[PDB]
């Protein structure tokens, strides 16, 4: 426990050193959803507070939101099967009869896995965490539920978590703060917590510390030490599991830091300059755009009897002493200010892969400078994204299967415990993963296209009935099905195909025998 | 009751903290439909008041209404089947004969479910709640009716409900205030209320509190406590069901707050500047656009005999004392004001996915510079919406089925109570859901396209009669029907298909035997 | 350099003998407003801050 507090205090000091830059970056990118506001209290103490009044320019907030939405649709397209379970290395080479039966089972698992995820709040939680990772770091908590909602997802605010990192930059200890949680609420989030020892009514509030760390001198099943306690060091729950609830995202990382640095953090100094420029324009327009006058005194005409009517004569003291009344002097270089603002806006847009051809008031471009500029923006965006698939979503899938095992133990029943742990931990031994996103097309269309290209050349030189004869039809059928990602149940097994092939051989032997030809 | 008053007073304090920003945000977005006006009473005290006289710029109100309308047609397109009931996990893997009979029943349930919804005020209530969620929070009440109108929907004004939140931001207590309800009205809304004990004539008005909260230490069927009482603490109804009437919507949420923050809330500071700029232009135009004159006195000409006809001579004292009569001096920079207004208008439009090509008098560009910008806005809109499907409408469907069971108990008759409750709760155990919206096309067309692509490759290498022979036709037919979302009754059952296939084999044997070939 | 220049070349600024040429605390920026201004102080009238430089030159090298 004393060691826990030393780790928590060290992780708390790191967060304090990040507060200044992260609060500023969030302010210019997501002013209304800034979790670092009010020194991390956000809306806990004073809800309904105004935050975005001094954000005059919305270029960065708009581009930041659209980039996060775009990443969500291209990485985990909702209503699509963007990941597949495949047989692991223990089942041998693909295409064998034994591998085919395992492939059928993993296709069933993939269908059931997505039915669970599609009815959860997975996409709501991922979308919020992606907006966090564009600035520094996203955190997703995956927790057990009940038979009605087996899996609960949540985007943990970055201002309420603290980290300890290992030498390689990976996270090996997480501390999450819960502010003023009711006692009755504690039992629902942590069913096995010991709340009786606190001796409090089921409406009192208490601060909760949810701690976890990697125990290096422990076996795999005890690797993650999990503790729930109060701010007065009253331990409510202690556990040791093979995983912890959280997954931590970084797009890019400066060495020696655990929290990342995303493109929206690179943009905020530019946003700060733009907002200052627009604020000056609003101040200037009040006395430069409006008709105003200079005189010795404002009594040059009577404001109360002033009559703004067509044809009206206004009594005016046209000269007062030495000075006549004149229009307020025009000053400044309005165009200069709205040349820097436009230039800096486009840098933000290019930095965040947004608005490939300017704003609405942009110069005209034909099908030449618009199609190319569109594909230039699209190609660069599609180059950044796919490398983040394994970092972001493989740990999420592994933790989801672990939760499903805990909440629905029947799903992994009648299985030896040794292979059950390997199966739940999707590592490629017994169960593997294969992502299918709009960026990484299929990897199997290439194999099929090469096979079709070979046949066209072969049939051009030797004709059909010779190119087809120089083929292993059972192997070709099985490989075409795997290349296309087809359901195994839709095609006959290898043994059925071999029996069919042998029968076709006898049919041709009898057919040829009736024409005097012996094969 | 003493605990109820503490909970309600806490929830009221949160609402009072939100009143200032929400009344301001509703003013610039929906000035005529602001529920926070007159300290929440709105039109209950004084109907027919003017609210929008000081809204000079309609950019935000137009974009706000169009976005809410656009979300309605893309999430729940009226006159279409935007959700389907499917068999739950208890029925096993899809495609089996037992699953196929459950699928026929759920398809019948879907048709009947939409007949009830299509004749109710569902779409009217959802459309109004979507306008509320674009600012902070939408609330929909789903109440029991009679056999003529089984389900009643209502968009609850956000200024008349109060919330208590759990530690994860979910609502776990709702308090709705009813202002000056007649006694005869109480019995129609809550049929089993004890109105007789009040000893009042059926025309007196009484304030009503409609309270509900989650009882954490209670079983599933008693989880939601529901109390109706008067403002003088006179309990009229007490219940404990498995659900409560309301569903609460948030698009985005700042941590620590229960009410959300939507894009229209992010836009109102910009709208405030635009409105202030336009008000100045209106003030300026009255004495800058109109022809006015400055002189020592308005007696420079006789206004009563002034004759404005062509060729007329007007007697004018062209000089009075030292000062001649001259046009009222022009001042200001009109173009400056109409450069900020247009710039801020487009930011509002981009923030709310409205008017990709700008206003009517826009700098028109070529076709491609317009088609690309149109697809930029459509793609960004189609990314935000789908993640809100489960948050908004799954609880609505579950509560609708609960009301249907209560009002029409014969619909779930001859069903064991254990499975009846699991069926009413559409949680994926016995009954699941599947959405079909213009944003998520089918998820089954991908499976069919892969199957068709595999067959084209197989028939290219091996020809027809060989690609077809290497198929499980019964499985193919059943999976094609499921992928297309087709009605099960339109196709023969698996046993009928297998009998047909067996007969087709016998036909082939006899026809081959007549040619001297034995299969 | 452009950012430094814009703060006093793009914004409307004025030169005078003293910043007491008008009262910043009671300055009223509304349409039709008359601002009391000491239009000449001693020998020097109040005038817009003098424009200088060649903005186009800088945004030709960049």
Fold and architecture overview:
The structure is cut from a larger assembly and holds three copies of chain A. Chain A has 519 residues and is of the alpha+beta class. Chain A is built from 13 helices and 15 strands. A five-stranded antiparallel beta sheet of chain A has the order 4-5-6-7-8. Chain A has a three-stranded antiparallel beta sheet with strand order 3-2-9, with helices on one face. In chain A, a hairpin with a 5-residue loop joins strand 4 (161-165) and strand 5. In chain A, helix 2 crosses helix 4. The first copy, chain A, starts with a helix and ends in a 6-residue tail after the last helix. Chains in contact: A-B, A-C, B-C.
* Beta strand % of chain A: 15-25%
Percent helix of chain A, as a range, is: 40-55%
Number of helices of chain A: 13
Instruction: Report the span from N to C terminus of chain A.
Output: 84 Å
Structural class of chain A, please? alpha+beta
Rg of chain A computed from alpha carbons, rounded to a whole number of angstroms: 33 Å
Q: Largest beta sheet of chain A: what is the strand line-up?
A: 4-5-6-7-8
Number of strands of chain A: 15
Oligomeric state: part of a larger assembly
Keywords (chains A, B): Plasmid, Viral genome packaging, Viral release from host cell
Subcellular location (chains A, B): Virion
Main location (chains A, B): virion
């Amino acid at each position: 426990v004393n060691r826990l507090c030393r780790m928590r205090n060290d992780a708390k000091s790191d967060l304090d050193m990040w507060r200044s830059i992260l609060q500023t970056a969030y302010h210019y990118a997501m002013p209304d959803y800034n979790p670092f506001e009010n020194y991390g209290l956000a809306g806990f103490l004073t809800p309904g507070q105004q935050y975005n009044a001094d954000i005059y320019d919305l270029t960065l907030p708009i581009a930041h939101k659209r980039l996060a939405d775009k990443m969500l649709m291209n990485m985990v397209p909702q209503g699509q099967q963007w990941v597949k379970f495949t047989p692991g290395d223990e089942f041998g080479e693909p295409g064998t009869p034994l591998y085919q039966r395992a492939l059928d089972a993993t296709q069933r698992m993939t269908d059931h896995f997505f039915k669970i995820i599609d009815r959860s709040n997975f996409y709501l939680a991922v979308g919020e965490s992606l907006q966090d990772v564009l600035i520094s770091t996203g955190i997703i908590a995956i927790n057990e539920g009940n038979r009605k909602r087996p899996v609960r997802y949540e985007a943990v605010p970055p201002a309420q978590v603290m980290f300890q990192g290992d030498a390689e930059g990976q996270v090996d200890a997480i501390f999450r703060d819960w502010y003023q949680v009711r006692i009755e609420n504690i039992k629902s989030m942590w069913p096995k917590a010991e709340v009786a020892k606190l001796n409090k009514k089921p409406e009192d509030k208490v601060d909760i510390w949810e701690c976890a760390w990697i125990d290096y001198e422990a076996p795999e099943k005890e690797r993650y030490q999990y503790v729930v306690m109060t701010s007065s060091k009253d331990v409510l729950l202690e556990q040791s599991n093979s995983s912890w609830p959280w997954v931590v995202y970084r797009m890019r990382r400066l060495t020696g830091e655990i929290r990342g640095r995303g493109p929206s953090l690179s943009a905020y100094p530019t946003a700060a300059t733009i907002n200052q420029a627009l604020e000056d324009e609003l101040v200037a327009a009040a006395f430069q755009a409006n008709p105003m006058y200079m005189a010795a005194s404002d009594s040059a005409f009577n404001q109360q009897t002033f009559t703004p009517r067509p044809g009206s004569i206004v009594p005016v003291q046209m000269v007062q002493g030495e000075w006549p009344i004149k229009p307020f002097e025009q000053s400044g270089n309005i165009q200069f200010n709205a040349l820097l603002v436009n230039d800096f806006r486009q840098q933000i847009n290019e930095l965040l892969y947004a608005f490939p051809l300017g704003a609405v008031n942009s110069p005209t471009r034909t099908a030449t400078e618009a199609e190319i500029r569109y594909t230039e923006n699209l190609e660069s965006f599609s180059a950044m994204v796919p490398r983040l698939q394994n970092e972001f979503f493989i740990p999420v899938i592994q933790r989801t299967l672990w939760v499903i095992n805990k909440v629905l133990p029947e799903t992994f029943a009648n299985i030896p415990d040794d292979i059950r742990n390997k199966m739940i931990s999707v590592d490629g031994q017994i169960l593997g993963l294969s992502f299918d996103t709009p960026l990484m097309t299929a990897k199997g269309q290439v194999k099929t296209a090469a096979l079709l290209g070979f046949y066209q050349a072969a049939a051009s030189l030797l004709g059909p009935e010779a190119a087809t004869a120089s083929l292993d039809p059972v192997e070709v059928l099985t490989n075409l099905a795997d290349n296309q990602g087809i359901d195994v149940r839709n095609i006959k097994t290898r043994e059925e195909l071999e029996q069919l092939l042998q029968a076709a051989g006898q049919i041709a032997q009898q057919e040829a025998a009736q024409q005097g030809v012996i094969i």
